[PDB]
Amino acid sequence: DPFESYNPEFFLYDIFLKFCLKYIDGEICHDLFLLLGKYNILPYDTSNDSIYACTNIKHLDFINPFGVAAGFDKNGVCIDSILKLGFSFIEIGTITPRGQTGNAKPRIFRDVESRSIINSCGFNNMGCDKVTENLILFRKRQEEDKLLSKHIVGVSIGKNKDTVNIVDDLKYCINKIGRYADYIAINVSSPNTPGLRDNQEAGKLKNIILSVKEEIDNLEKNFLWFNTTKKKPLVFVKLAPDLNQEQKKEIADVLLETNIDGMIISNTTTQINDIKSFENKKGGVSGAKLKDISTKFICEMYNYTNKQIPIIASGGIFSGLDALEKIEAGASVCQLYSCLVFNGMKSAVQIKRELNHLLYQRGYYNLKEAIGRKHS
Numbered sequence: 481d482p483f484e485s486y487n488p489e490f491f492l493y494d495i496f497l498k499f500c501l502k503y504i505d506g507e508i509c510h511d512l513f514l515l516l517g518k519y520n521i522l523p524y525d526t527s528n529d530s531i532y533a534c535t536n537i538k539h540l541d542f543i544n545p546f547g548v549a550a551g552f553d554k555n556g557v558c559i560d561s562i563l564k565l566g567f568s569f570i571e572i573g574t575i576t577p578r579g580q581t582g583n584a585k586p587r588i589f590r591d592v593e594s595r596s597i598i599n600s601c602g603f604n605n606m607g608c609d610k611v612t613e614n615l616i617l618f619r620k621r622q623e624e625d626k627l628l629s630k631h632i633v634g635v636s637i638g639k640n641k642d643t644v645n646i647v648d649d650l651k652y653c654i655n656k657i658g659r660y661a662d663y664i665a666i667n668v669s670s671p672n673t674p675g676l677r678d679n680q681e682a683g684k685l686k687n688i689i690l691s692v693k694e695e696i697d698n699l700e701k702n703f704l705w706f707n708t709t710k711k712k713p714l715v716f717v718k719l720a721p722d723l724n725q726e727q728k729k730e731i732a733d734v735l736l737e738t739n740i741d742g743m744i745i746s747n748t749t750t751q752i753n754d755i756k757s758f759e760n761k762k763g764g765v766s767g768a769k770l771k772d773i774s775t776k777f778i779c780e781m782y783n784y785t786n787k788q789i790p791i792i793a794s795g796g797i798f799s800g801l802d803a804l805e806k807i808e809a810g811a812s813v814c815q816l817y818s819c820l821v822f823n824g825m826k827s828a829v830q831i832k833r834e835l836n837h838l839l840y841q842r843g844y845y846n847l848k849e850a851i852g853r854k855h856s
């Protein structure tokens with residue numbers, strides 16, 4: 481009930497959201513969300529998640545299948561509040577070794593009609609040292625907090641605008657923040673850092689993955705794991721949707737050869753040009769117009785990797801049916817971003833309820849049974 485109690489479905493957040501979406505600049509709305517979360521004003525989801533919808537990637541045990549994608553809490557300033565909206569994990573970042581402002585504002589625009597976003601942020605963030613401090617404070621609160629004990633935090637790492645060789649920046653971040661992360665996401669897919677997506681070429685990607693796995697493995701050589709797993713972070717790579725079939729196949733071969741732990745499919749696209757209000761805007765597109773592109777990409781990569789590399793789905797997930805489509809395509813877990821922007825505080829409670837209903841209606845015993853079922 482949205483009227484009798486303060487909870488994630490509280491009606492006033494919907495009224496306010498509809499006002500913001502009509503009249504207020506996107507990044508300003510986001511700053512207000514982060515302000516509310518920073519002060520823990522936001523409501524909590526207090527309910528037991530269904531045991532039949534839990535999922536895992538190796539030893540990462542997600543209490544439910546929905547997390548928040550990178551770029552939402554770039555600096556890790558309200559991890560707690562976002563998770564307590566009902567999400568099982570969050571990926572903070574993308575961070576870089578040194579703080580940087582990113583591109584000039586305005587650099588984010590929304591199209592409500594088509595539930596789409598375009599952004600040219602440019603990796604704005606406070607820098608690895610400060611974000612590490614934020615994550616350490618979270619980890620210290622998490623040890624005492626009944627609600628946060630099993631929640632997972634990943635960290636997405638990238639390079640500073642000026643950096644020649646991306647591996648130097650990735651190594652700096654791993655050595656600073658890696659011991660507080662449940663997983664590291666290697667961002668080689670932003671469309672807003674010129675040349676970054678060239679690092680998806682097989683030779684370059686292979687060297688990047690091995691360098692990152694080596695730097696993580698060297699942490700124990702130099703109490704250690706102050707994270708949820710109590711184990712060294714897993715390594716994921718976040719992939720761009722704008723690739724041809726030859727590129728996707730060579731990437732899949734590298735992911736198999738390097739024993740990467742998972743792949744995040746996918747980042748924003750540069751190939752959607754049928755949104756009027758975006759016509760002269762720069763950046764990558766998120767939201768409902770990305771859904772089909774990224775689901776097909778999941779199917780392709782699940783098959784190219786012989787179902788051996790777990791998939792984190794990202795792209796146009798708004799509803800329980802969208803989530804089930806991703807899972808049946810091959811994903812083990814889903815990340816939301818645009819859903820939070822357009823459906824607001826209730827996003828996680830609503831989508832979890834809708835997916836539990838679908839799993840019943842479709843005859844699945846649990847969610848794991850549905851993973852990859854399109855291909856069976």
Ligand SMILES: Cc1cc2nc3c(=O)[nH]c(=O)nc-3n(C[C@H](O)[C@H](O)[C@H](O)COP(=O)(O)O)c2cc1C
Pocket residue numbers: 549550551552573574588597598599601603636667718746747748766767768770794795796797815816817818819
């Ligand atoms: C404003 C904005 C900033 C983003 N920043 C990052 C980022 O820093 N790192 C990253 O890997 N993805 C970033 N993303 C991409 C999202 O993580 C996600 O992959 C994408 O928005 C597709 O999901 P969606 O359709 O549910 O929005 C950003 C997206 C938006 C809209």
Ligand SMILES: Cc1cc([C@@H](C)NC(=O)c2[nH]cc(-c3c[nH]c4cc(C(F)(F)F)ccc34)c2C)no1
Pocket residue numbers: 492493496497500501506507508509510512513516551552588590597820821822823824825
């Ligand atoms: C980085 C980055 C992202 C962006 C853009 C894409 N993000 C948003 O548009 C955004 N993010 C979160 C909300 C929100 C949901 N529900 C709300 C409720 C309120 C309330 F008014 F009730 F307080 C305010 C905001 C929200 C909105 C509208 N810009 O930069």
Ligand SMILES: O=C(O)c1cc(=O)[nH]c(=O)[nH]1
Pocket residue numbers: 551574599600601602603604667669670671672747748764
């Ligand atoms: O900072 C950004 O511009 C950004 C990064 C990223 O990975 N994806 C995206 O759409 N934007």
